Amino acid sequence: EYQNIFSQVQVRGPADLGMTEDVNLANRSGVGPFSTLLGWFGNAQLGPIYLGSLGVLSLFSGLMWFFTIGIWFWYQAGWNPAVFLRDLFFFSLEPPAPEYGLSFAAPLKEGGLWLIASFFMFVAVWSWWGRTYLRAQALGMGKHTAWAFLSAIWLWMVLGFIRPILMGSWSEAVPYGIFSHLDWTNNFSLVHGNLFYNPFHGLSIAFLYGSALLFAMHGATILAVSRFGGERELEQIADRGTAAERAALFWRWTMGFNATMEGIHRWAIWMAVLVTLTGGIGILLSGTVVDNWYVWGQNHGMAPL
């Protein structure tokens, strides 16, 4: 009857400081508090966190980005805490107006402060990518996380930097707001015909649904075979046990083919990087090559015409 969804007994010992492969231990912190809720679901220990030079860079730039957007929101609220709470999710930093193009001459109230915040955010995100690469390297691991993050960065860069330059205007970029960037996506789909008829939109949606499908499948399988110690997959790769065998046989008797304890993770990483990569391509194509996706679909056998 136990479904292994929540832990039923929770044990604590000395905190684990981690490995020392070639990490600079002076740049680590201490262990944080233990948390019983996280212990119910997963691990209870918090920390230690590594903070080196790239971490200082990322923290400074991201803090400045968050602070710039927040101070703009406070200016819009009239420095009123009540108005700030009420109209939160309604404030936004807008990019420059279309008349200014790509120029950096737009005023602070119009689009200059958006440019400042965007510079801060660009630096923060690229330094965080460098941090993921260097943290993988210090421990001697492969850089799979860095390249998957690079896929995500590719979509972010297309949305905020690459497509506005190809279109020749900063006004093409995304505002910094909660409802405002949602309105931005709706207007983007409306201006460019119907984004449903962008085929790379369709591929991106296929791979998003595929991520949900695959990782429900995989989480359920690991939970189902965890009675045999299936969740310790790194040693099921080195020493195949009955858990991996039973998982493979379930999926082979069900859908005709199966995976390994490592090939399934290759499937996983590719299924997610593909959603973000195809999305980047589809957004870059919108407006620069196709200005009306429904008409493109009519010309390409996708709409009745």
Partner: protein
């Protein structure tokens, strides 16, 4: 035919309906009672799709569409060429899905594993049934369901969304999208981490789960663990699908207006309703 380790697991037991009857394999597949049922329903649905394509007059697989009955039929039968085929295909699709889930249960109990996978699949079946059965039945007609076509069910999505203005102002929609995005992020991170531990720098030994724990503790200051990450993936996927089903079931049944107008209850709270500043003032 068999995997190098498959032979010892193929034993006579664990069926739900029938006994030694239907207790055999066809190639790699296991075909029980519900295997036969699944095959029948799926083949019938696929042939009926092809026959609907014949009726419609198109052979382009991207233009084939099977439409539900018009609103004038309500929740009753329709002529085959004018909505009856859609109803038959819906019954076949439901039967195929439910028989697939029951076949998976039979495989689970033949292999001695838990039934997490059929439960997770049942969540998706319930989302499909929400879109095709529960919401049309509450709304009063089969024509509120979506058509069976590659690019026309996207037309259904577009029209249904734009009936209520901009659709990602629906709150449960916001929750479902957040869960979907978080799930894709978690899947990418998990696959990358496992691969990087199993495939280190060239000439290195394999890493251990301690190295993975250390990698994410160095990166973000917290590691959820292996059991934790698999529980998280299952729950993120299921919560995404559950909240999508909810946001659709409340859409044409309780709500009827633009959702951006729903968000005005927060703005019109009595203690800041009339303060003159900001966006809504």
């Amino acid at each position: 035919a068999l995997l190098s380790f498959e032979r010892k697991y193929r034993v006579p037991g664990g069926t739900l309906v029938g006994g030694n009857l239907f207790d055999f394999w066809v190639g790699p597949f296991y075909v029980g009672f519900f295997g036969v049922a699944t095959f029948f329903f799926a083949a019938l649905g696929i042939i009926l799709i092809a026959w609907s394509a014949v009726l419609q007059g198109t052979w382009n697989p991207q233009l084939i569409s099977v439409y539900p009955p018009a609103l004038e039929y309500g929740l009753g039968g329709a002529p085959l060429a004018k909505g009856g085929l859609w109803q038959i295909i819906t019954i076949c699709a439901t039967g195929a899905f439910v028989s697939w889930a029951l076949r998976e249960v039979e495989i689970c109990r033949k292999l001695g594993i838990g039934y997490h996978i059929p439960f997770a699949f049942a969540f998706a079946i319930l989302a499909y049934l929400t879109l095709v059965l529960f919401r049309p039945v509450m709304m009063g007609a089969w024509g509120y369901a979506f058509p069976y076509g590659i690019w026309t069910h996207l037309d259904w999505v577009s029209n249904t969304g734009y009936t209520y203005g901009n659709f990602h102002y629906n709150p449960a929609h916001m929750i479902a999208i957040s869960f979907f995005f978080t799930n894709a992020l978690a899947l990418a991170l998990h696959g990358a981490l496992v691969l990087s531990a199993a495939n280190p720098e060239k000439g290195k030994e394999m890493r251990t789960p301690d190295h993975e724990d250390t990698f994410f503790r160095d990166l973000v200051g917290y590691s959820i663990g292996t059991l934790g990450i698999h529980r998280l993936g299952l729950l993120l996927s299921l919560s995404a699908v559950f909240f999508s089903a909810l946001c659709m079931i409340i859409t044409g049944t309780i709500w009827f207006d633009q959702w951006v107008d729903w968000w005005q209850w927060w703005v019109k709270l009595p203690w800041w309703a009339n303060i003159p500043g900001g966006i809504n003032g």
